[PDB]
Amino acid sequence: GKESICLPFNFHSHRQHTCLDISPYGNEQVSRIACTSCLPTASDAMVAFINQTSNIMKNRNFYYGFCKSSELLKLSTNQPPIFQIYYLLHAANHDIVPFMHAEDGRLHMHVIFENPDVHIPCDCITQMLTAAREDYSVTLNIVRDHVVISVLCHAVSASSVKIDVTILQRKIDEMDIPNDVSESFERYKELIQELCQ
Amino acid sequence: KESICLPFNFHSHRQHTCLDISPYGNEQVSRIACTSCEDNRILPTASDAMVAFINQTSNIMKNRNFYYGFCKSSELLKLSTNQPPIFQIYYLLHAANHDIVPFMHAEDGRLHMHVIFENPDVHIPCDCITQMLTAAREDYSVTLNIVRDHVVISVLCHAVSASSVKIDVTILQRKIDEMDIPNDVSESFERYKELIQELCQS
Ligand SMILES: [Zn+2]
Ligand SMILES: [Zn+2]
């Protein structure tokens, strides 16, 4: 590929018009023009955030990461970028497992990639950066031989929209958790502990 | 139902009341007992107003008075694209009251807006107030006053928080450059010249 990157990779290091390519052979950034592997905008993802309660099942993979915590879910409703960043990553890569964690009164998200080969399209990165601007760090690392994108919130700025929290909590409480989703969290128990600590 | 003192900061809002301003006085009324809200239909939320903010370049004619308030400043227009609450608040007020004239100005990259009501009788529905407070929260003050015998809502920005969306500024600026300014809009600004200069000290 075109150029090695150092891990952990903070997305503030993103070179315009490049994709990230992670494989067992190395960690690289490549020209989007030259990329053989190569989506919604941050605005689209904000509309989806606004419309969450109309799309609970559609966004079920997101809500599993809360592990039925009403407290975490409430925090998410004050922080659109958590949902926005998941939504963007999910569009480019379905084989992901997000886990949410609160620290210092703020919600943070770790997105665990199931497969060892991971391509992050340029168009995904640029939209994540829009969603993350100022108040979040977004970093890619390999942790326990898994690619993980960590979304850490430094400050929670006022959101100028309100979600119906009660409706959202009720729908999340009612969701079934499939066996394979519970199993994946158990698989990743040591990984999740490392990320959170 | 009850007299209010001006200036009225919207953080003083009594739950489930409307504001009614007329030559006879400045009052807050129970939303249940309000006859103006009997007639009207369900107004947009702060969420609807954010979707409108996102979709601005598709709705230029509808929101034309918003853009006239920039008085042709590309700098002020650009700032508005980093501060959704300015547009949101205008959108919310416009839904409840079409006869308004917004005027914008900036300090140190923080955009402010004053909304001048054309008519001396002004009704601010409860539902409008609550959505404005959602849009404003933390970073803006929203105040109602009578200034030079005009009802004016002032939206003052204390801090600009990060916005997690980006508008196509270039497209918006080109659409704004292309708008014609009707004679009566230019005339209204000249009518309000002294009012605008009074409000601009904030
Ligand atoms: Zn690519
Ligand atoms: Zn009313």
From Swiss-Prot, chain A:
Annotated transmembrane regions: none
UniProt-recorded Gene Ontology molecular function terms: zinc ion binding
Q: Single Gene Ontology BP term?
A: viral budding from nuclear membrane
What effect on the protein does mutating C35S have, as reported in its record?
Partial relocalization in the host nucleoplasm
| Record keywords | Host membrane, Host nucleus, Membrane, Metal-binding, Phosphoprotein, Zinc, Zinc-finger
Result of mutating H119A?
Partial relocalization in the host nucleoplasm
PTM comment for this protein? Answer: Phosphorylated at serine residues in the N-terminus. This phosphorylation regulates the localization within the inner nuclear membrane.
Protein's cellular compartments: Host nucleus inner membrane
First and last residues of each zinc finger (CCCH-type) = 19-119
GO cellular component terms, A-Z: host cell nuclear inner membrane; membrane
What function does this protein fulfil? Plays an essential role in virion nuclear egress, the first step of virion release from infected cell. Within the host nucleus, NEC1 interacts with the newly formed capsid through the vertexes and directs it to the inner nuclear membrane by associating with NEC2. Induces the budding of the capsid at the inner nuclear membrane as well as its envelopment into the perinuclear space.
Family per UniProt? Belongs to the herpesviridae NEC1 protein family.
Q: Describe the subunit structure.
A: Forms a heterohexameric complex with NEC2. Interacts with capsid vertex specific component 2/CVC2; this interaction directs the capsid to the host inner nuclear membrane to initiate budding.
The name under which this protein is listed is: Nuclear egress protein 1
Q: Give the gene symbol.
A: NEC1
